[PDB]
């Protein structure tokens, strides 16, 4: 009985080693491990015969549905196409922003003007919207 238990503990210790070198020493992109809310810093303390982990996590609530586009392009120049970085292009619903489209974060809703910091240039595609007038990145 002792030999069996000793083996299972050794395997369990290997799992603990991996979590310390991933979930404690770094933010993790995996999902899976830790609490089910992305990952943000985790901590570890001693417990009898083992380690006790605590994982801080992020839980979304109050989801809303909005209109969004795959990307944007200049109607006057079909080779200028952009797509959002780490976020989405949404139809604006904000009184502060005169622009027809706005940028938001992928974990939290909040509109912002579209600027070159939030975009990347991409090859053109049929689903991109054609903008007849005002786009700041490129201005032309």
């Amino acid at each position: 009985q002792q030999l069996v238990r000793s083996e299972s503990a050794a395997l369990s210790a290997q799992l603990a080693k991996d979590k310390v070198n991933e979930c404690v020493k770094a933010q993790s992109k995996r999902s899976g491990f830790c609490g089910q809310g992305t990952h943000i810093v985790s901590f570890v303390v001693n417990a009898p015969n083992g380690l006790y982990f605590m994982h801080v996590g992020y839980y979304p609530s109050n989801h809303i549905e909005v209109v969004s586009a795959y990307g944007l392009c200049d109607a006057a120049n079909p080779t200028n196409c952009i797509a959002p970085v780490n976020g989405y292009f949404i139809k604006t619903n904000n009184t502060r922003i005169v622009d027809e489209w706005s940028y938001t974060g992928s974990s939290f809703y909040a509109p912002e003007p579209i600027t070159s910091l939030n975009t990347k240039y991409v090859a053109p595609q049929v689903t991109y919207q054609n903008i007849s007038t005002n786009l700041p990145p490129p201005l032309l």
Partner: antibody, heavy 119, light 111 residues
Framework: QVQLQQSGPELVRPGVSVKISCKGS????????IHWVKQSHAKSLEWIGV????????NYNQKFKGRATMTVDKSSSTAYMELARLTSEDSAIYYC???????????????WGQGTSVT | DIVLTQSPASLAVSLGQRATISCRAS??????????MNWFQQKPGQPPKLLIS???NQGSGVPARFIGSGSGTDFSLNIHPVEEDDTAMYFC?????????FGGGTKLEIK
């Protein structure tokens, strides 16, 4: 208790640039775009432009792009419009207005200033 | 921009009579089913006032008395209880695209 105060009317001579102002009251001025409209007749009204009061971004009616500009005095809670090169065809009642969304994704003119006029 | 027109150029009705306004668009205003249509009211000596939006026949500053209707290129305004304080110029508005032009309007009158 929202209000849109405005500058007095004037009989300005042609070729003179004209500055018009509208001051918001009873709300935070920086959270709403200002809209401007021109009226020459009970049946003749047209959009002039829109100005964000937080970012300074604008859009204008194509006919005024070479003549009109807009500014904001954030400490006076006021917006301004200036129109270069006045002519008799510009006599109108001018109106500032506050942007809103009563319906999702539909711009609405909301409250309007009482108007001012230039001739 | 979409040209908007309206008819009849003026309408006269008896008090408490139902009344309507027809409004046509040169091109549809629906984009993603949003509609983007606003109606306004104006009287002499004052600025225009918002009445309705295509999904708001109450709210947006009015009683349920002002009913917007239609889709695509065709729209209308419907008031079952007209009163003498409803005499006003009325205007269809395009919010879908810049310049954001709008109709010259029509005038309601009490006979």
């Amino acid at each position: 208790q929202v209000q849109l105060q405005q500058s007095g009317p004037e009989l300005v001579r042609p070729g003179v640039s004209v500055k018009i102002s509208c001051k918001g009251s009873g709300y935070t001025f920086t959270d709403y775009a200002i809209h401007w409209v021109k009226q020459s007749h009970a049946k003749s009204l047209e959009w002039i432009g829109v100005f964000s009061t937080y970012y300074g971004n604008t859009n204008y009616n194509q006919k005024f792009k070479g003549r009109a500009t807009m500014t904001v005095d954030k400490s006076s809670s006021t917006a301004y419009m200036e129109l270069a090169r006045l002519t008799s065809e510009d006599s109108a009642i001018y109106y500032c207005a506050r942007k809103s969304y009563y319906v999702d994704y539909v711009d609405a003119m909301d409250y309007w200033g009482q108007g001012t006029s230039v001739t | 921009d979409i040209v908007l027109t309206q008819s009849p150029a003026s309408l006269a009705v008896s008090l408490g009579q139902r009344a309507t306004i027809s409004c046509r668009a040169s091109e549809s205003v629906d984009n993603y089913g949003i509609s983007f249509m606003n109606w306004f009211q104006q009287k002499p000596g004052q600025p225009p006032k918002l009445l309705i939006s295509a999904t708001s026949n109450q709210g947006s500053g009015v009683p349920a008395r002002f009913i917007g209707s239609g889709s695509g290129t065709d729209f209308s305004l419907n008031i079952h209880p007209v009163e003498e304080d409803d005499t006003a110029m009325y205007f269809c508005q395009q919010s879908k695209e810049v310049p954001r032009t709008f109709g010259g309007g029509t005038k309601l009158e009490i006979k």
